[PDB]
Symmetry: C2
Subunit: 300 residues, 2 copies
Amino acid sequence: SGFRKMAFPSGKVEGCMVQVTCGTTTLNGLWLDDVVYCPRHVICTSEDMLNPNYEDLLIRKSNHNFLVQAGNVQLRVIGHSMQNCVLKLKVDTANPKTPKYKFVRIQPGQTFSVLACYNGSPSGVYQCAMRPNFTIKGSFLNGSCGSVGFNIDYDCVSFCYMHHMELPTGVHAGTDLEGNFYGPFVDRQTAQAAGTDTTITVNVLAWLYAAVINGDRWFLNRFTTTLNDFNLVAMKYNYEPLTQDHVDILGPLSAQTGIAVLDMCASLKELLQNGMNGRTILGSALLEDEFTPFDVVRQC
Amino acid sequence: SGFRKMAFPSGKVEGCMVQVTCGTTTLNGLWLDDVVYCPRHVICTSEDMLNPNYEDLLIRKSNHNFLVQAGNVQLRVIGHSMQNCVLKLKVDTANPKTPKYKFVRIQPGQTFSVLACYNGSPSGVYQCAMRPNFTIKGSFLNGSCGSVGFNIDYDCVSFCYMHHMELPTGVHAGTDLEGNFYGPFVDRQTAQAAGTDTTITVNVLAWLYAAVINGDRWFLNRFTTTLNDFNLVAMKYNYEPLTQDHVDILGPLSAQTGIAVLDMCASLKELLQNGMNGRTILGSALLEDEFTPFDVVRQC
Protein backbone atom coordinates (compact mmCIF):
# COMPACT_ATOMS: atom_id res chain seq x y z
CA SER A 1 0.00 0.00 0.00
CA GLY A 2 3.05 2.25 0.40
CA PHE A 3 4.60 4.12 3.32
CA ARG A 4 5.14 7.88 3.29
CA LYS A 5 5.97 10.68 5.69
CA MET A 6 2.47 12.07 6.09
CA ALA A 7 1.40 15.27 7.84
CA PHE A 8 -1.97 15.90 9.43
CA PRO A 9 -4.61 17.82 7.46
CA SER A 10 -3.95 21.50 8.12
CA GLY A 11 -7.40 23.02 7.63
CA LYS A 12 -8.14 23.53 11.32
CA VAL A 13 -4.78 25.26 11.85
CA GLU A 14 -4.92 27.44 8.70
CA GLY A 15 -7.89 29.31 10.16
CA CYS A 16 -5.82 30.25 13.23
CA MET A 17 -2.81 31.89 11.56
CA VAL A 18 -2.49 35.67 11.74
CA GLN A 19 0.26 38.21 11.09
CA VAL A 20 1.86 40.15 13.96
CA THR A 21 3.98 43.28 13.35
CA CYS A 22 5.89 45.46 15.90
CA GLY A 23 7.88 48.17 14.17
CA THR A 24 9.39 46.62 11.22
CA THR A 25 9.53 43.12 12.70
CA THR A 26 6.80 40.79 11.37
CA LEU A 27 6.08 37.13 12.14
CA ASN A 28 3.19 34.72 12.54
CA GLY A 29 0.68 34.53 15.36
CA LEU A 30 -1.72 31.85 16.54
CA TRP A 31 -5.24 33.17 17.10
CA LEU A 32 -7.33 31.11 19.48
CA ASP A 33 -10.40 32.50 21.20
CA ASP A 34 -9.50 36.07 22.05
CA VAL A 35 -5.77 35.71 22.33
CA VAL A 36 -2.99 35.82 19.83
CA TYR A 37 0.20 33.90 20.63
CA CYS A 38 3.52 34.70 18.96
CA PRO A 39 7.25 34.70 19.77
CA ARG A 40 8.22 37.54 22.08
CA HIS A 41 11.18 38.57 19.93
CA VAL A 42 8.72 40.33 17.61
CA ILE A 43 9.40 43.37 19.83
CA CYS A 44 13.13 43.34 19.05
CA THR A 45 15.00 45.26 16.39
CA SER A 46 17.91 43.63 14.66
CA GLU A 47 20.28 45.06 17.20
CA ASP A 48 18.10 44.10 20.18
CA MET A 49 18.35 40.41 19.22
CA LEU A 50 22.08 40.34 20.01
CA ASN A 51 21.47 40.71 23.77
CA PRO A 52 17.84 41.56 24.60
CA ASN A 53 16.33 42.47 27.95
CA TYR A 54 12.78 41.45 27.10
CA GLU A 55 11.25 42.90 30.27
CA ASP A 56 12.80 46.30 29.53
CA LEU A 57 11.95 46.12 25.82
CA LEU A 58 8.31 45.13 26.37
CA ILE A 59 7.81 47.98 28.85
CA ARG A 60 8.39 50.41 26.05
CA LYS A 61 5.48 48.85 24.12
CA SER A 62 1.75 49.49 24.49
CA ASN A 63 -1.29 47.75 23.02
CA HIS A 64 -1.44 50.01 19.95
CA ASN A 65 2.18 49.15 19.07
CA PHE A 66 1.08 45.63 18.06
CA LEU A 67 -0.57 45.35 14.64
CA VAL A 68 -2.48 42.07 14.24
CA GLN A 69 -4.06 41.33 10.85
CA ALA A 70 -6.12 38.25 9.96
CA GLY A 71 -6.02 38.26 6.19
CA ASN A 72 -7.12 41.81 5.38
CA VAL A 73 -8.99 42.68 8.60
CA GLN A 74 -7.16 44.39 11.48
CA LEU A 75 -7.72 43.08 15.01
CA ARG A 76 -7.79 45.52 17.93
CA VAL A 77 -5.28 44.75 20.69
CA ILE A 78 -6.75 45.44 24.14
CA GLY A 79 -4.09 43.76 26.27
CA HIS A 80 -0.66 42.19 26.19
CA SER A 81 1.49 40.10 28.56
CA MET A 82 4.70 37.98 28.35
CA GLN A 83 4.61 34.29 29.33
CA ASN A 84 8.07 32.87 29.27
CA CYS A 85 9.18 33.28 25.66
CA VAL A 86 5.83 34.00 24.04
CA LEU A 87 3.60 37.11 23.88
CA LYS A 88 -0.14 36.88 24.49
CA LEU A 89 -2.02 39.72 22.80
CA LYS A 90 -5.64 39.94 23.93
CA VAL A 91 -7.89 41.06 21.07
CA ASP A 92 -11.46 42.31 21.00
CA THR A 93 -12.70 39.60 18.61
CA ALA A 94 -12.87 35.88 19.31
CA ASN A 95 -11.63 33.79 16.40
CA PRO A 96 -14.81 32.20 14.97
CA LYS A 97 -12.63 29.47 13.40
CA THR A 98 -11.19 28.40 16.77
CA PRO A 99 -11.17 24.57 16.79
CA LYS A 100 -11.25 22.35 19.83
CA TYR A 101 -7.68 22.60 21.01
CA LYS A 102 -5.26 21.98 23.85
CA PHE A 103 -1.67 22.92 24.62
CA VAL A 104 0.67 19.97 25.16
CA ARG A 105 4.40 19.72 25.82
CA ILE A 106 5.60 16.93 23.55
CA GLN A 107 8.20 14.35 24.56
CA PRO A 108 11.48 13.75 22.73
CA GLY A 109 11.07 11.18 19.98
CA GLN A 110 7.45 12.10 19.26
CA THR A 111 6.31 13.56 15.95
CA PHE A 112 4.05 16.41 14.88
CA SER A 113 3.01 18.33 11.77
CA VAL A 114 4.28 21.85 11.06
CA LEU A 115 2.23 24.44 9.17
CA ALA A 116 4.99 26.65 7.79
CA CYS A 117 3.69 30.21 7.40
CA TYR A 118 4.96 33.57 6.18
CA ASN A 119 3.31 36.94 6.88
CA GLY A 120 0.46 35.00 8.49
CA SER A 121 -0.23 33.01 5.31
CA PRO A 122 0.16 29.21 5.18
CA SER A 123 2.94 28.01 2.87
CA GLY A 124 3.17 24.25 3.38
CA VAL A 125 2.83 21.29 5.73
CA TYR A 126 5.33 18.62 6.74
CA GLN A 127 5.96 16.15 9.56
CA CYS A 128 8.78 16.66 12.06
CA ALA A 129 10.10 14.83 15.10
CA MET A 130 11.30 16.34 18.36
CA ARG A 131 14.90 15.10 18.34
CA PRO A 132 16.34 13.68 21.58
CA ASN A 133 18.44 16.86 21.79
CA PHE A 134 15.21 18.92 21.51
CA THR A 135 15.84 20.31 18.03
CA ILE A 136 13.84 19.71 14.86
CA LYS A 137 14.89 19.36 11.22
CA GLY A 138 12.39 21.53 9.39
CA SER A 139 12.27 24.18 6.66
CA PHE A 140 12.03 27.70 8.12
CA LEU A 141 13.02 30.85 6.25
CA ASN A 142 12.98 34.37 7.70
CA GLY A 143 9.50 35.37 8.82
CA SER A 144 8.52 31.75 9.51
CA CYS A 145 8.73 32.34 13.27
CA GLY A 146 5.36 31.84 14.92
CA SER A 147 4.61 28.79 12.77
CA VAL A 148 3.15 26.04 14.95
CA GLY A 149 3.48 22.28 15.22
CA PHE A 150 0.48 20.18 16.13
CA ASN A 151 -1.22 16.80 16.30
CA ILE A 152 -4.82 16.04 15.64
CA ASP A 153 -6.83 13.55 17.62
CA TYR A 154 -10.19 13.21 16.03
CA ASP A 155 -11.46 16.74 16.28
CA CYS A 156 -9.02 18.21 18.77
CA VAL A 157 -5.87 20.06 17.82
CA SER A 158 -2.96 19.55 20.20
CA PHE A 159 -0.57 22.45 19.66
CA CYS A 160 2.90 21.52 20.91
CA TYR A 161 5.45 23.68 19.07
CA MET A 162 6.04 27.28 18.02
CA HIS A 163 9.08 28.15 15.94
CA HIS A 164 11.59 30.68 17.28
CA MET A 165 15.12 30.21 15.96
CA GLU A 166 17.60 28.41 13.70
CA LEU A 167 20.76 26.79 15.01
CA PRO A 168 24.21 26.93 13.35
CA THR A 169 23.98 23.23 12.49
CA GLY A 170 20.97 23.99 10.29
CA VAL A 171 18.44 22.70 12.81
CA HIS A 172 15.61 24.59 14.48
CA ALA A 173 14.47 25.32 18.03
CA GLY A 174 11.24 26.60 19.52
CA THR A 175 8.88 26.55 22.48
CA ASP A 176 5.66 24.96 23.58
CA LEU A 177 2.59 27.19 23.54
CA GLU A 178 3.32 28.32 27.10
CA GLY A 179 6.59 29.85 25.88
CA ASN A 180 8.98 27.30 27.41
CA PHE A 181 11.79 26.34 25.05
CA TYR A 182 12.40 22.72 24.19
CA GLY A 183 15.97 22.05 25.23
CA PRO A 184 18.52 24.46 26.70
CA PHE A 185 18.07 27.26 24.18
CA VAL A 186 17.34 30.97 24.73
CA ASP A 187 15.92 33.54 22.32
CA ARG A 188 19.09 35.57 21.80
CA GLN A 189 21.30 35.95 18.72
CA THR A 190 24.34 34.12 20.09
CA ALA A 191 26.09 30.85 19.30
CA GLN A 192 24.36 27.95 21.08
CA ALA A 193 25.12 24.23 21.01
CA ALA A 194 22.41 21.59 20.69
CA GLY A 195 24.63 18.77 21.95
CA THR A 196 25.06 15.24 20.68
CA ASP A 197 21.93 14.04 18.92
CA THR A 198 20.77 10.48 19.53
CA THR A 199 18.88 8.16 17.21
CA ILE A 200 15.35 7.32 18.36
CA THR A 201 15.75 3.54 18.53
CA VAL A 202 12.08 2.61 18.99
CA ASN A 203 11.28 4.72 15.93
CA VAL A 204 13.83 2.88 13.77
CA LEU A 205 12.31 -0.45 14.80
CA ALA A 206 8.81 0.82 14.02
CA TRP A 207 10.03 1.89 10.58
CA LEU A 208 11.72 -1.49 10.03
CA TYR A 209 8.38 -3.11 10.86
CA ALA A 210 6.66 -0.82 8.36
CA ALA A 211 9.11 -2.08 5.73
CA VAL A 212 8.27 -5.71 6.47
CA ILE A 213 4.55 -4.93 6.25
CA ASN A 214 5.28 -3.49 2.79
CA GLY A 215 7.30 -6.53 1.67
CA ASP A 216 10.85 -5.35 2.41
CA ARG A 217 12.53 -8.26 4.20
CA TRP A 218 16.13 -8.58 2.95
CA PHE A 219 17.55 -7.13 6.19
CA LEU A 220 15.99 -9.92 8.29
CA ASN A 221 18.45 -12.54 9.53
CA ARG A 222 18.54 -15.70 11.66
CA PHE A 223 19.95 -14.12 14.82
CA THR A 224 18.21 -12.88 17.93
CA THR A 225 19.63 -10.84 20.79
CA THR A 226 18.90 -9.63 24.31
CA LEU A 227 17.91 -6.18 25.53
CA ASN A 228 21.25 -5.63 27.29
CA ASP A 229 23.20 -7.06 24.33
CA PHE A 230 21.49 -4.80 21.78
CA ASN A 231 21.90 -1.78 24.07
CA LEU A 232 25.65 -2.39 24.20
CA VAL A 233 25.48 -1.90 20.43
CA ALA A 234 22.92 0.93 20.70
CA MET A 235 25.15 2.98 23.02
CA LYS A 236 28.09 2.54 20.65
CA TYR A 237 26.24 4.03 17.65
CA ASN A 238 24.57 6.81 19.70
CA TYR A 239 21.18 5.07 19.68
CA GLU A 240 18.81 5.41 22.61
CA PRO A 241 18.66 2.41 24.97
CA LEU A 242 15.71 0.12 24.34
CA THR A 243 13.41 -0.55 27.29
CA GLN A 244 10.57 -2.97 27.96
CA ASP A 245 8.17 -0.05 27.51
CA HIS A 246 9.50 0.31 23.96
CA VAL A 247 9.07 -3.45 23.43
CA ASP A 248 5.45 -3.15 24.58
CA ILE A 249 4.76 -0.16 22.31
CA LEU A 250 6.03 -2.18 19.34
CA GLY A 251 3.54 -4.92 20.29
CA PRO A 252 0.99 -4.26 17.54
CA LEU A 253 3.72 -4.19 14.89
CA SER A 254 5.42 -7.34 16.20
CA ALA A 255 2.07 -9.15 16.22
CA GLN A 256 1.14 -8.05 12.68
CA THR A 257 4.48 -9.22 11.28
CA GLY A 258 5.09 -12.23 13.52
CA ILE A 259 8.62 -10.90 14.11
CA ALA A 260 9.66 -10.71 17.75
CA VAL A 261 11.07 -7.35 18.84
CA LEU A 262 14.39 -8.90 19.88
CA ASP A 263 14.58 -10.64 16.49
CA MET A 264 14.22 -7.25 14.80
CA CYS A 265 16.85 -5.82 17.16
CA ALA A 266 19.32 -8.42 15.87
CA SER A 267 18.58 -7.34 12.29
CA LEU A 268 19.04 -3.69 13.26
CA LYS A 269 22.27 -4.62 15.05
CA GLU A 270 23.54 -6.25 11.86
CA LEU A 271 22.45 -3.18 9.87
CA LEU A 272 24.37 -0.98 12.32
CA GLN A 273 27.49 -3.17 12.35
CA ASN A 274 27.60 -4.08 8.64
CA GLY A 275 25.74 -1.30 6.82
CA MET A 276 23.16 -1.65 4.07
CA ASN A 277 25.52 -2.73 1.23
CA GLY A 278 24.04 -0.34 -1.33
CA ARG A 279 20.45 -1.55 -0.92
CA THR A 280 17.43 0.53 0.16
CA ILE A 281 14.61 0.13 2.70
CA LEU A 282 11.22 1.73 1.94
CA GLY A 283 12.99 3.85 -0.65
CA SER A 284 15.70 5.03 1.75
CA ALA A 285 19.40 4.19 1.99
CA LEU A 286 19.48 5.33 5.64
CA LEU A 287 17.81 4.17 8.85
CA GLU A 288 14.76 6.40 9.41
CA ASP A 289 13.96 7.39 13.00
CA GLU A 290 11.22 10.02 12.54
CA PHE A 291 8.26 7.59 12.46
CA THR A 292 6.80 6.72 15.84
CA PRO A 293 5.15 3.32 16.38
CA PHE A 294 1.81 5.15 16.39
CA ASP A 295 2.66 6.76 13.04
CA VAL A 296 3.37 3.32 11.57
CA VAL A 297 0.12 1.85 12.92
CA ARG A 298 -1.77 4.72 11.26
CA GLN A 299 -0.54 3.85 7.74
CA CYS A 300 0.00 0.09 7.84
CA SER B 1 17.18 27.21 6.66
CA GLY B 2 16.44 23.51 5.95
CA PHE B 3 14.92 21.64 3.02
CA ARG B 4 11.94 19.29 3.38
CA LYS B 5 9.33 17.58 1.24
CA MET B 6 6.44 19.96 1.83
CA ALA B 7 2.80 19.54 0.83
CA PHE B 8 0.36 22.34 0.13
CA PRO B 9 -2.07 23.38 2.88
CA SER B 10 -5.06 21.07 2.49
CA GLY B 11 -7.84 23.19 3.99
CA LYS B 12 -9.45 24.10 0.67
CA VAL B 13 -9.48 20.44 -0.38
CA GLU B 14 -10.73 19.06 2.96
CA GLY B 15 -14.03 20.91 2.48
CA CYS B 16 -14.62 19.09 -0.82
CA MET B 17 -14.27 15.46 0.33
CA VAL B 18 -17.41 13.32 0.57
CA GLN B 19 -18.25 9.64 0.96
CA VAL B 20 -19.78 7.69 -1.94
CA THR B 21 -21.32 4.25 -1.37
CA CYS B 22 -22.71 1.77 -3.91
CA GLY B 23 -23.77 -1.45 -2.22
CA THR B 24 -20.89 -2.34 0.08
CA THR B 25 -18.32 -0.52 -2.06
CA THR B 26 -17.44 2.78 -0.36
CA LEU B 27 -14.82 5.28 -1.51
CA ASN B 28 -14.14 9.02 -1.58
CA GLY B 29 -15.73 11.65 -3.78
CA LEU B 30 -14.82 15.21 -4.73
CA TRP B 31 -17.70 17.68 -4.26
CA LEU B 32 -17.42 20.81 -6.33
CA ASP B 33 -20.40 22.97 -7.14
CA ASP B 34 -23.25 20.54 -7.66
CA VAL B 35 -21.32 17.53 -8.85
CA VAL B 36 -19.53 14.71 -7.04
CA TYR B 37 -16.60 13.07 -8.85
CA CYS B 38 -15.47 9.57 -7.89
CA PRO B 39 -13.85 6.48 -9.46
CA ARG B 40 -16.35 4.55 -11.55
CA HIS B 41 -15.43 1.21 -9.96
CA VAL B 42 -17.56 2.15 -6.94
CA ILE B 43 -20.35 0.35 -8.85
CA CYS B 44 -18.36 -2.91 -8.92
CA THR B 45 -18.63 -5.85 -6.58
CA SER B 46 -15.45 -7.78 -5.76
CA GLU B 47 -16.26 -10.19 -8.60
CA ASP B 48 -17.08 -7.41 -11.08
CA MET B 49 -13.57 -5.96 -10.68
CA LEU B 50 -12.00 -9.04 -12.29
CA ASN B 51 -13.44 -8.19 -15.73
CA PRO B 52 -15.97 -5.34 -15.58
CA ASN B 53 -18.20 -4.08 -18.36
CA TYR B 54 -18.76 -0.64 -16.86
CA GLU B 55 -21.44 0.42 -19.35
CA ASP B 56 -23.48 -2.71 -18.60
CA LEU B 57 -22.88 -2.42 -14.85
CA LEU B 58 -23.81 1.28 -14.69
CA ILE B 59 -27.08 0.72 -16.57
CA ARG B 60 -28.31 -1.38 -13.61
CA LYS B 61 -27.81 1.66 -11.35
CA SER B 62 -30.19 4.56 -10.78
CA ASN B 63 -29.72 7.82 -8.89
CA HIS B 64 -31.04 6.38 -5.62
CA ASN B 65 -28.41 3.61 -5.71
CA PHE B 66 -25.67 6.17 -4.98
CA LEU B 67 -25.39 7.21 -1.32
CA VAL B 68 -23.41 10.45 -1.00
CA GLN B 69 -22.62 11.67 2.52
CA ALA B 70 -20.88 14.94 3.41
CA GLY B 71 -20.02 14.39 7.04
CA ASN B 72 -23.43 13.44 8.44
CA VAL B 73 -25.75 15.01 5.83
CA GLN B 74 -27.00 12.85 2.96
CA LEU B 75 -26.85 14.58 -0.41
CA ARG B 76 -29.64 13.85 -2.88
CA VAL B 77 -28.44 12.41 -6.21
CA ILE B 78 -30.50 13.82 -9.09
CA GLY B 79 -28.32 12.61 -11.96
CA HIS B 80 -25.38 10.44 -12.89
CA SER B 81 -23.12 9.93 -15.89
CA MET B 82 -19.84 8.30 -16.68
CA GLN B 83 -16.85 10.25 -18.10
CA ASN B 84 -14.02 7.87 -19.00
CA CYS B 85 -13.11 6.28 -15.69
CA VAL B 86 -14.89 8.70 -13.31
CA LEU B 87 -18.53 9.01 -12.38
CA LYS B 88 -20.15 12.38 -12.09
CA LEU B 89 -23.08 12.39 -9.65
CA LYS B 90 -25.22 15.50 -9.92
CA VAL B 91 -26.56 16.52 -6.51
CA ASP B 92 -29.27 18.98 -5.47
CA THR B 93 -26.98 21.12 -3.28
CA ALA B 94 -23.98 23.15 -4.40
CA ASN B 95 -20.98 22.72 -2.11
CA PRO B 96 -20.81 25.99 -0.11
CA LYS B 97 -17.08 25.35 0.46
CA THR B 98 -16.26 25.09 -3.26
CA PRO B 99 -12.97 26.95 -3.82
CA LYS B 100 -11.72 28.52 -7.00
CA TYR B 101 -10.59 25.46 -8.92
CA LYS B 102 -9.62 24.05 -12.29
CA PHE B 103 -8.89 20.61 -13.71
CA VAL B 104 -5.41 20.12 -15.15
CA ARG B 105 -3.63 17.13 -16.64
CA ILE B 106 -0.18 17.20 -15.08
CA GLN B 107 3.00 16.39 -17.00
CA PRO B 108 5.43 13.62 -16.01
CA GLY B 109 8.08 14.88 -13.62
CA GLN B 110 5.77 17.44 -12.00
CA THR B 111 4.77 17.24 -8.35
CA PHE B 112 1.51 17.64 -6.46
CA SER B 113 0.03 17.17 -2.99
CA VAL B 114 -2.21 14.23 -2.08
CA LEU B 115 -4.93 14.45 0.57
CA ALA B 116 -5.33 10.81 1.55
CA CYS B 117 -8.90 10.14 2.71
CA TYR B 118 -10.92 7.20 4.01
CA ASN B 119 -14.73 7.06 4.14
CA GLY B 120 -14.77 10.70 3.02
CA SER B 121 -12.60 11.83 5.95
CA PRO B 122 -9.10 13.29 5.46
CA SER B 123 -6.29 11.25 6.99
CA GLY B 124 -3.07 12.97 5.93
CA VAL B 125 -1.24 15.03 3.32
CA TYR B 126 1.98 14.32 1.44
CA GLN B 127 3.80 15.35 -1.70
CA CYS B 128 4.03 13.06 -4.78
CA ALA B 129 5.57 13.24 -8.23
CA MET B 130 4.11 11.90 -11.46
CA ARG B 131 6.83 9.42 -12.43
CA PRO B 132 7.99 9.31 -16.06
CA ASN B 133 6.20 5.93 -16.27
CA PHE B 134 3.00 7.65 -15.03
CA THR B 135 2.88 6.01 -11.60
CA ILE B 136 3.17 7.59 -8.16
CA LYS B 137 4.75 6.37 -4.92
CA GLY B 138 2.12 7.19 -2.32
CA SER B 139 0.33 5.71 0.69
CA PHE B 140 -3.09 4.30 -0.24
CA LEU B 141 -4.91 1.61 1.73
CA ASN B 142 -8.26 0.07 0.82
CA GLY B 143 -10.95 2.72 0.68
CA SER B 144 -8.45 5.43 -0.30
CA CYS B 145 -9.74 5.55 -3.88
CA GLY B 146 -11.20 8.92 -4.76
CA SER B 147 -8.45 10.75 -2.89
CA VAL B 148 -7.19 13.59 -5.05
CA GLY B 149 -3.89 15.24 -5.89
CA PHE B 150 -3.66 18.98 -6.34
CA ASN B 151 -1.55 22.11 -6.56
CA ILE B 152 -2.39 25.56 -5.15
CA ASP B 153 -1.64 28.74 -7.10
CA TYR B 154 -2.52 31.56 -4.72
CA ASP B 155 -6.19 30.92 -4.23
CA CYS B 156 -6.88 28.39 -6.96
CA VAL B 157 -6.86 24.62 -6.55
CA SER B 158 -5.64 22.77 -9.65
CA PHE B 159 -6.93 19.22 -9.25
CA CYS B 160 -4.77 16.88 -11.33
CA TYR B 161 -5.05 13.37 -9.85
CA MET B 162 -7.66 10.96 -8.50
CA HIS B 163 -6.53 7.65 -7.05
CA HIS B 164 -7.83 4.40 -8.58
CA MET B 165 -5.49 1.44 -8.15
CA GLU B 166 -2.31 -0.14 -6.78
CA LEU B 167 0.20 -1.86 -9.03
CA PRO B 168 2.02 -5.14 -8.25
CA THR B 169 5.27 -3.21 -7.73
CA GLY B 170 3.74 -1.30 -4.81
CA VAL B 171 3.17 1.87 -6.84
CA HIS B 172 -0.12 3.60 -7.58
CA ALA B 173 -2.08 4.69 -10.64
CA GLY B 174 -4.99 7.02 -11.22
CA THR B 175 -6.71 9.47 -13.54
CA ASP B 176 -7.07 13.17 -14.09
CA LEU B 177 -10.38 14.71 -13.08
CA GLU B 178 -11.79 13.94 -16.54
CA GLY B 179 -11.30 10.23 -15.84
CA ASN B 180 -8.39 9.62 -18.22
CA PHE B 181 -5.73 7.39 -16.68
CA TYR B 182 -2.16 8.57 -16.52
CA GLY B 183 -0.21 5.91 -18.37
CA PRO B 184 -1.40 2.71 -20.02
CA PHE B 185 -3.45 1.40 -17.11
CA VAL B 186 -7.09 0.28 -17.00
CA ASP B 187 -9.44 -0.06 -14.02
CA ARG B 188 -9.62 -3.85 -13.95
CA GLN B 189 -8.24 -6.36 -11.43
CA THR B 190 -5.61 -7.89 -13.70
CA ALA B 191 -1.82 -7.94 -13.72
CA GLN B 192 -0.52 -4.75 -15.32
CA ALA B 193 3.04 -3.55 -15.87
CA ALA B 194 4.19 0.06 -15.54
CA GLY B 195 7.35 -0.26 -17.64
CA THR B 196 10.85 0.94 -16.90
CA ASP B 197 10.87 3.98 -14.65
CA THR B 198 13.18 6.85 -15.53
CA THR B 199 14.87 9.24 -13.13
CA ILE B 200 13.72 12.85 -13.54
CA THR B 201 17.14 14.34 -14.29
CA VAL B 202 16.17 18.01 -14.01
CA ASN B 203 14.67 17.27 -10.59
CA VAL B 204 17.90 15.66 -9.35
CA LEU B 205 19.86 18.73 -10.47
CA ALA B 206 17.37 21.05 -8.77
CA TRP B 207 17.76 19.04 -5.55
CA LEU B 208 21.55 19.17 -5.84
CA TYR B 209 21.23 22.95 -6.13
CA ALA B 210 19.05 22.95 -3.01
CA ALA B 211 21.84 21.10 -1.19
CA VAL B 212 24.43 23.70 -2.21
CA ILE B 213 22.10 26.48 -1.03
CA ASN B 214 21.95 24.72 2.35
CA GLY B 215 25.74 24.37 2.57
CA ASP B 216 26.19 20.79 1.30
CA ARG B 217 29.03 20.97 -1.24
CA TRP B 218 31.17 17.81 -0.92
CA PHE B 219 29.89 16.39 -4.23
CA LEU B 220 31.13 19.40 -6.22
CA ASN B 221 34.21 18.65 -8.33
CA ARG B 222 36.45 20.63 -10.69
CA PHE B 223 35.08 19.06 -13.89
CA THR B 224 32.54 20.18 -16.45
CA THR B 225 30.80 18.37 -19.29
CA THR B 226 28.61 18.89 -22.35
CA LEU B 227 24.91 18.27 -22.84
CA ASN B 228 25.57 15.35 -25.20
CA ASP B 229 28.35 13.90 -23.04
CA PHE B 230 26.18 13.94 -19.91
CA ASN B 231 23.22 12.46 -21.80
CA LEU B 232 25.44 9.59 -22.94
CA VAL B 233 25.86 8.96 -19.20
CA ALA B 234 22.21 9.75 -18.36
CA MET B 235 20.86 7.05 -20.70
CA LYS B 236 23.15 4.45 -19.14
CA TYR B 237 21.61 5.03 -15.70
CA ASN B 238 18.00 5.35 -16.96
CA TYR B 239 18.01 9.11 -16.41
CA GLU B 240 15.98 11.42 -18.62
CA PRO B 241 18.02 13.28 -21.27
CA LEU B 242 18.77 16.89 -20.39
CA THR B 243 17.61 19.59 -22.81
CA GLN B 244 18.22 23.32 -23.13
CA ASP B 245 14.72 23.86 -21.72
CA HIS B 246 15.86 22.03 -18.57
CA VAL B 247 18.98 24.22 -18.43
CA ASP B 248 16.79 27.32 -18.69
CA ILE B 249 14.42 26.16 -15.94
CA LEU B 250 17.43 25.66 -13.66
CA GLY B 251 18.47 29.27 -14.37
CA PRO B 252 17.33 30.76 -11.04
CA LEU B 253 19.15 28.03 -9.10
CA SER B 254 22.33 28.26 -11.19
CA ALA B 255 22.29 32.04 -10.66
CA GLN B 256 21.80 31.84 -6.89
CA THR B 257 24.64 29.33 -6.43
CA GLY B 258 27.00 30.58 -9.14
CA ILE B 259 27.33 26.99 -10.39
CA ALA B 260 26.80 26.51 -14.12
CA VAL B 261 24.28 23.82 -15.04
CA LEU B 262 26.87 21.85 -17.01
CA ASP B 263 29.21 22.15 -14.03
CA MET B 264 26.49 20.59 -11.87
CA CYS B 265 25.97 17.91 -14.52
CA ALA B 266 29.60 16.84 -14.05
CA SER B 267 29.15 16.39 -10.29
CA LEU B 268 26.02 14.31 -10.92
CA LYS B 269 27.87 12.20 -13.49
CA GLU B 270 30.58 11.50 -10.92
CA LEU B 271 27.91 10.71 -8.32
CA LEU B 272 26.36 8.27 -10.79
CA GLN B 273 29.67 6.66 -11.77
CA ASN B 274 31.33 6.68 -8.33
CA GLY B 275 28.44 6.51 -5.87
CA MET B 276 28.17 8.61 -2.73
CA ASN B 277 30.85 6.77 -0.68
CA GLY B 278 28.67 6.42 2.41
CA ARG B 279 28.03 10.17 2.57
CA THR B 280 24.66 11.92 2.54
CA ILE B 281 23.13 14.89 0.73
CA LEU B 282 20.39 16.88 2.50
CA GLY B 283 19.96 13.96 4.88
CA SER B 284 19.60 11.42 2.06
CA ALA B 285 21.96 8.69 0.87
CA LEU B 286 20.10 8.50 -2.47
CA LEU B 287 19.69 10.98 -5.31
CA GLU B 288 16.24 12.54 -4.90
CA ASP B 289 14.23 13.28 -8.06
CA GLU B 290 10.83 14.29 -6.65
CA PHE B 291 11.59 18.01 -6.19
CA THR B 292 10.91 20.14 -9.24
CA PRO B 293 12.98 23.29 -9.84
CA PHE B 294 9.88 25.26 -8.86
CA ASP B 295 9.65 23.31 -5.59
CA VAL B 296 13.27 24.19 -4.79
CA VAL B 297 12.83 27.89 -5.63
CA ARG B 298 9.83 28.00 -3.29
CA GLN B 299 11.68 26.73 -0.21
CA CYS B 300 14.96 28.50 -0.99
